[PDB]
């Protein structure tokens, strides 16, 4: 439901969604059947207010899925996996991620144009980086990726002999405290939803840079803009458009209005990142980005350090190795997935150079 929160015009907001945002950053939505009262959180500040509040849970209205947990059990599991995303860990991983990116751009430059960038480059790249971060053994990566019992069997086996990566760390440091199913669940979230979001950022972000050739070249002239460019790209794309509802556990005042106990709040990251026409233009020279593309609060994207590193490496290397890159069809013909709660993405991206 609430399909209006996902209406777009290519990468931008649809007029119907812009009109909704004019009703304020916090919109009360009583259901027509009188079964519940829902809320739309559409503004940057209000979305952060909701997501930072302790007075909401993620009740429904799979083991190892942090998004389906509330404190204290959410805290318990997240604290065990968080060290895998430390700065020290990303620094040690960076050169290997660079090499994986180079592997896939090697394949791309050798196949010669054209290429379907989503299936042939972005997808495999994201899945291979995920395998490296997780520490998947080499002989299991091909099958694990093809699959996008096996997971439980894989998790139990790697749990017996801890290796490298996040999965080895967790099992090595929290062997008895995490089960096979929970480990498998941590792996699945990384290999499934996470790759979907990352691959979409890679493909749609490449399209976004191609539609702004001045900045495509600027990122090549000044690769130090990579970190800034990533923040602007994830803000502009908002591939994770809307969040699971947050239900108020008690009466709480948000954005000047009282959200009653039991009412559900739907945060629109898309609206929060894009509704403000001031400072909405795509501009990678912006030194600081105002966005909630990775969420906020206790459920803030645990993989943001990896996503930010991988995307920086990918975009900077791409613009450098393919200065002549261009869409093989007019940009206006690219197909985007119709409105849905699923990750936002294009369906294919034919490129040549
Ligand atoms: C490297 C790949 C990624 C991995 C492994 C990853 C893993 C996660 C995990 C495990 C959570 C749940 C945290 C919790 O509930 O405590 C999470 C939350 C989130 N991730 Fe990431 N993520 C990754 C890349 C992204 C990307 C590319 C985006 C979009 C730009 C993204 C947008 C989010 C959002 C919006 C949430 C919060 C959902 C909510 O609060 O309801 N993630 N991510």
Residue numbers in the entry: 5 to 65, 76 to 162, 180 to 384
Task: Give sentences from the paper.
Cytochrome P450 enzymes (P450s) are a superfamily of monooxygenases that utilize a cysteine thiolate–ligated heme moiety to perform a wide range of demanding oxidative transformations. Within GPA biosynthesis, P450s function in a specific, stepwise manner to install the essential side-chain crosslinks in the core peptide in a process that typically requires one Oxy enzyme per crosslink to be installed. Given the apparent preference for the unusual heme orientation shown by OxyA enzymes, we investigated the OxyA homolog from kistamicin biosynthesis (OxyAkis), which is an atypical GPA. Structural and biochemical analysis of OxyAkis has shown that this P450 enzyme is highly prone to oxidation and can display an atypical heme orientation in different protein batches.
